[PDB]
Design a protein around this nucleic acid. Sequence first.
RNA 1: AGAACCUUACCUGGUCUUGACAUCCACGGAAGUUUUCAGAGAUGAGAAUGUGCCUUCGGGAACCGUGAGACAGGUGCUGCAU
RNA 2: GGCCGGGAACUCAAAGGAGACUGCCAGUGAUAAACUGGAGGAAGGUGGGGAUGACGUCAAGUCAUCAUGGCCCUUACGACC
RNA 3: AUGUUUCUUCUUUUUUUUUUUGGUGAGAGG
Lengths: 50, 157, 105, 492
Amino acid sequence: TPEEKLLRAIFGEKASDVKDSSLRVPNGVSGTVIDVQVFTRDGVEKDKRA
Amino acid sequence: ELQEKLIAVNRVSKTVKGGRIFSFTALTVVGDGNGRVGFGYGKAREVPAAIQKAMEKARRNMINVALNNGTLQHPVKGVHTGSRVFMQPASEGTGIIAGGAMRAVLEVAGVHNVLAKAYGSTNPINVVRATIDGLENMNSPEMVAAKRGKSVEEILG
Amino acid sequence: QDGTFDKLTKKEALMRTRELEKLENSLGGIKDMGGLPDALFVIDADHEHIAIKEANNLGIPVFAIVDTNSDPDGVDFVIPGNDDAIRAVTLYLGAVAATVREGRS
Amino acid sequence: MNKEILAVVEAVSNEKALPREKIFEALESALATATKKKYEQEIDVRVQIDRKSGDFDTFRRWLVVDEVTQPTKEITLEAARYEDESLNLGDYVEDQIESVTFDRITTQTAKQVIVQKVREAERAMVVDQFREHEGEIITGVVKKVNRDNISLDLGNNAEAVILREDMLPRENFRPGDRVRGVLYSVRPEARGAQLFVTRSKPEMLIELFRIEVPEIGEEVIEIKAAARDPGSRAKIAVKTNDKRIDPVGACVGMRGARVQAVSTELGGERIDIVLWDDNPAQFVINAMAPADVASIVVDEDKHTMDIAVEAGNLAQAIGRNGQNVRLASQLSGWELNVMTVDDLQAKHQAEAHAAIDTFTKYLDIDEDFATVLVEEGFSTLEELAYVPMKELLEIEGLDEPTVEALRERAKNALATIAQAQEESLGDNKPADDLLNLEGVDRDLAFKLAARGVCTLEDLAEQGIDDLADIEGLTDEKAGALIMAARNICWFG
RNA sequence: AGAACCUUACCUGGUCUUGACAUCCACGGAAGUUUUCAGAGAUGAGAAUGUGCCUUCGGGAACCGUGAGACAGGUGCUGCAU
RNA sequence: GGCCGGGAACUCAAAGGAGACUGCCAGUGAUAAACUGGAGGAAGGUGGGGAUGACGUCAAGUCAUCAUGGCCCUUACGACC
RNA sequence: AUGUUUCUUCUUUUUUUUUUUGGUGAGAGG
């Protein structure tokens, strides 16, 4: 659409009518994150938290 | 309103090197029936436009006659170029007859009692100029009591 | 005043200004008139005789300055006065402007 | 991507006849607003779209101000000039910020702002081009019927409203019906209908006649006045400068065809067409049609006219519920009193007797001399006191000494009547009771007492509307005085 | 914008007359196919043999005959009937 | 043998346009119209040419391009070789 | 210098749409 040609222009890095979703997780439970494990298959770049 | 009444149709031509093109002179008359009379002169290249173009002049040619009791005043001379028609009085004679192609003109003034006779040459074109011109210089008894005598009631008796 | 050249050739538009200007001075500032007025003032009836003919057929009362050579057959208000002067016609025009100063209120 | 911005700008510019610049300014504002919503904090944001590539940079805008009220969106001129010496009050300082990805959310916001810009550009220019329609009889389709208004669709996303007072009393519209009406008001309101359409006001009648009568559209015939009882009866006054044209006959048309077309569009409203006259009395005679008027008496001072009719015509002159006299009065601007010839003569005899009694009582003249003054047209003590001495000297039997004595007596009588009014209220009643009301000066107390408000109780009983005509009394000051009077009389 | 047959509507002679061509009506022949002939050719006189698809499978469209036809055919006239 | 490489300069090939209008200069002429010289240009006055045949005249020709009212043949004026 | 005969005409009344995220195995609650 005209607007969609401008949606392709500036931040078309956002595909078209994009909705890039992270691991947006669901509800029902509270909590406190006590322990985080990160396992990396060998060869892959370790990020800063790993 | 304008109470149309239409009469005339006959060809006229031009005779150019192409040929002769039949224009159509058509005449009529327009009036209320109670005092306002006046006509228009119309012609075209056909019949229905000429009766429509003659209308606009008849809107601006209505001339009053001070219709006394839906008739005339007194015998007046409608002499014009080609016809010398009299306007003979008939005070409620209850007869509406005038000249040929003048009768349909004197339905639109409204009258019901008058006599006539188109003296001279029997032409439909000098009629409608004269049958208003006869009606024009005609005046009701009040106006010719307004000027002569300088006593209105004494000519009235 | 804004366009009139960028829609056709430049050669055409001077004919338009020829059409505009010669119909500007000859149609005057009378384009916002009421079309059929109530009166018309005549300065001289020698060659403007067509007006006093035409202004009489619709019953419109129209004036007339007369000089020695013209006829009153058709005009309504015959006023005498010489038609060949510069300030005197404006003295006539200053006189009617006093009336037109009342001819607005 | 890049070339697509140019193709969208060109398509929208050509289709909506809108400046590309106005579309970009609005997209920048839309993207700035969409960016502001992604931050938890209230930030100021400027977006700039490149006009060749369609690429866009987003800032943290800092409105350069003299005094900072919002440190999250505003920066002082001294601090802004530390970064760029060229900045002035009202400029923006920027901050490298990640431009919002053009998702379908920003896309929807951009679409909404474009649509809103088109309403304030394309649709605004369409309304400007339709300057005639804004005033003439627009045609709409009924979209919705409510109890209090009808919503019309005019096309091109333009909506108009007919209010309940703007409808004819017997009209029943359904959704999908076509309706004509005059656009009488355009309001630039931020919410609601912008276009107000009437079928009840006199302008609807005038414009229907303009469309149906070519001679009115060509300015050959002028409508001078229109008076209307919507869906029942109207009167129009017509004038022409061309003596060859009957203006009434032109508006009626052949056998009434033109006036019947207008009447049919107005739900069978009866339309009288009258000749405008420059003489008020002759114009009122014409306005009273179809009733025959026998005589008119004009009171110029009261702006009223007494209309005598034959006893057989009285019911026609008044009309059903006074409709004929009311429409004639609205058309002329005069107050019209319709009576019989016998009643007019009885009224004039009663007025003459009251004037004779007044002159005999106050001028110390005999009844014979008072009768001569009334026969010469004097009805009030004010006329006798103030009229030019020449008019009084034209009366047979008045000499300059007698006229001077008569004027002195009339002035002394007016002064005695004024003083007796001031003593009835203003020297005792409105000098203590009505004066007590905080704010009443002696002049206002005498103005109140001239209306019969002589006491503080009389003032407590008034409405603001009853006092609105008193010179120097505003509605607020009237309301304050009435409340002060009520506080003393009813709550003291 | 091209007269050996053709074109050709003109002429001689020899021929069918519901006909060169069209649609329809009943029924037959399937359609198809090469070749021997009275004859100038036309037309007409013959012999060997064949038979795709749908099958509501008591048969139908694409092709011709014989018989009644309605018509068909008209470069036969009227350009001052258009 | 542009035949075999090479080239996008160039003829040619073919498209959307740029190019001309009395635009400018002077004399003359009613400050107009306007003729024609001076200039540059590929071309100078609708640059050379074609296409488009106004209202209409010959009631000009054609029924034999086709259509089509009457007329007659319709065992023939129709049809075949 | 000459150029038949009988032969031309003229304007006011006709016109319906519109479309009918599964299986298996184990455990548990009622």
